Design a protein around this ligand. Sequence first.
Ligand SMILES: CC(/C=C/C=C(C)/C=C/[C@@]12O[C@]1(C)C[C@@H](O)CC2(C)C)=C\C=C\C=C(C)\C=C\C=C(C)\C=C\[C@@]12O[C@]1(C)C[C@@H](O)CC2(C)C
Ligand SMILES: CC(/C=C/C=C(C)/C=C/[C@@]12O[C@]1(C)C[C@@H](O)CC2(C)C)=C\C=C\C=C(C)\C=C\C=C(C)\C=C\[C@@]12O[C@]1(C)C[C@@H](O)CC2(C)C
Lengths: 202, 41, 62, 159, 206
Amino acid sequence: RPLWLPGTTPPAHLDGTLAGDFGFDPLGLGQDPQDLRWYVQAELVHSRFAMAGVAGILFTDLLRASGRTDIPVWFEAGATKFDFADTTTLFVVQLILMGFVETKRWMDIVKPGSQAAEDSFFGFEAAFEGLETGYPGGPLFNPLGFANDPTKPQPLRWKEIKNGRLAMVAMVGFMVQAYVTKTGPIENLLTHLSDPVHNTII
Amino acid sequence: MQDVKTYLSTAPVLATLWFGFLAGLLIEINRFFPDALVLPL
Amino acid sequence: GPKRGSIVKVLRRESYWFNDTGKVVAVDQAPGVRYPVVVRFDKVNYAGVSTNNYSPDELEAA
Amino acid sequence: DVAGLTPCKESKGFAKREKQEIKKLESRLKLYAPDSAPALALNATIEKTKRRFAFYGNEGLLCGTDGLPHLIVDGDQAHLGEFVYPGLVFLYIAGWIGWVGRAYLIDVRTSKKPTEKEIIIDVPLALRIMSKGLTWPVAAIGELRSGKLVEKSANITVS
Amino acid sequence: NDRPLWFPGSKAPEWLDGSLPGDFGFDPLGLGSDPELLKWFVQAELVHCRWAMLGAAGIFIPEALTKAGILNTPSWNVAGDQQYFADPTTLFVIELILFAWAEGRRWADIVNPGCVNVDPVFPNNKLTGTDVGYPGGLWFDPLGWGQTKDAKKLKELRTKEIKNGRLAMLAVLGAVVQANYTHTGPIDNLLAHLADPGHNTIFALS
Ligand SMILES: CC(/C=C/C=C(C)/C=C/[C@@]12O[C@]1(C)C[C@@H](O)CC2(C)C)=C\C=C\C=C(C)\C=C\C=C(C)\C=C\[C@@]12O[C@]1(C)C[C@@H](O)CC2(C)C
Ligand SMILES: CC(/C=C/C=C(C)/C=C/[C@@]12O[C@]1(C)C[C@@H](O)CC2(C)C)=C\C=C\C=C(C)\C=C\C=C(C)\C=C\[C@@]12O[C@]1(C)C[C@@H](O)CC2(C)C
């Protein structure tokens, strides 16, 4: 398989069969069993949340540049916008909501039985995933039954994080750019395409 | 040449090289960023 | 006492090597020896010596 | 504001602490020609003084009843640039140093002559460890959680 | 075993044997004692003489063509203070970005020989070099020269190359020093010298 640098010298704690593996652990970060079985899930949730953030950042500024809506900028949407409720109330409500889901995910990470629902739904309300790691299922998470077979989801499970890493670096780019240019990201890109050899890092 | 590298791997020589490089770094920083009392970040 | 080349940990309360490990050299098997076990350590004491003899009931952790 | 100190860009005692120093420098300057090394050095010093005094007022430090900045090492959000912001980077650097030193000791200790590798450093291994010592918190906390950070059979004795 | 030395009557050092091209037994300070450092210093000197060839050809020929009433490029000293479409810092950043790739692949070749030879986009191009430092391949060797009999056509060519490269290094260092001693172009030095080789030399200033 290909590695990050062609002078490979690949590490031992990660050998193969892992989705999106390129032997990139130069700083020996996860070398212990718990460390790897935890960092896989960490990278998964990070990739997914950053993909969601990218999908919520691009579309808005793109359509606003091409003239479709009058929504505010990403670094201005949450920034002092009285829209429906008090922002702090929404923050507290979001924390109380995310608690009941992050606790379930934690439970399944540490002791992988959490599929059955509650409130007298002990019957036909089981989550039918049964995966190796934190990949849920059931109509509540995987309605269309796309994750069909094991030992050949590696293309799709690879695509997931190969897009999530790009989304993560894209999000960091969004933050740093909109912090140092004080301008929209697609506005930055257009002003760059105006004359590339003059619009660079200061 | 091997014994020369071993001698350069001694404690006083590595100490003075490290401290001189650090002194140069700090001196350059202070010549370019002088009178720093509060972090502007 | 213990076997040769065995790694034992000391329990002598007034020893420099207390709670430290060392490999036996050769335990004397005479009838009336009070401290037959001979153990050499990889760190000298305040006097500079690294070998010392103990009784078999005075040091064992394996 | 806090602690009865006024901001420095309004302190009527900072103006004097500036103009007196400026006038002293100019009195020194008037002993040469405007095209000589002492005059150039003194003008550079004056420009540096102006650039220094036109930065403290803009930062937000609070001056005293004598016209001197005072650091509010309290946790005040309006003053994080005085203690906690530089303190965090210092703690980062110091943890870096300590972690890479500890790791070098741990690695050297399992060798043939570990005492030799402490008066004669082996630059390849030391450099490797210094490089890997960038993510030291994620490693120190991981070693704490995994029970690899501390020993239990310490060799202290007291009769 | 018979070969000429940099110092007739002397004895070639033990770590030098004339196996590698350009060898004349010149190593007084013993800077190439162990082979671990020799295999690195040979690549250092090779890249150095090639870069110096490029730099000397870029400095001396345009100067002559400017003095020959043909070209009008400025002096080699002040080629930085000119008008290009981007600042020197931007061009330097682009240079470093482009050079990181090439120099990293060369570094990987030096450290682990042969670990990097195939096109990572079209995995069939397979550079044809065999010895580190001479990468071969259609890109770096179109005219086929370089794959010949084991010696006397390869070793001869390589030593004839290093012999030119050392001269180029000396020449460019000399141009650098002259451009600061006598504030004229490098060809003006030659002109003034040939005009009066008796009184026009380094001693004609102090
Ligand atoms: C998840 C993420 C970003 C998520 C962003 C989100 C949700 C954005 C949300 C919002 O925009 C919306 C939705 C709407 C806005 O109104 C509100 C906000 C809130 C603004 C970034 C991850 C970002 C993660 C990043 C950048 C990670 C980079 C890692 C790199 C480069 C390498 C790391 C290493 O681990 C390796 C690989 C090997 C080790 O040996 C070496 C090291 C270095 C340790
Ligand atoms: C690489 C090199 C030159 C490269 C030139 C370049 C890139 C050209 C650059 C330019 O085109 C640009 C960029 C812009 C142009 O407008 C201007 C310039 C600036 C001109 C010279 C090397 C020059 C290197 C030189 C001259 C080295 C001489 C070394 C010697 C003699 C060493 C001898 C010993 O090391 C041994 C052999 C053995 C030991 O035991 C004994 C001792 C003595 C230690």
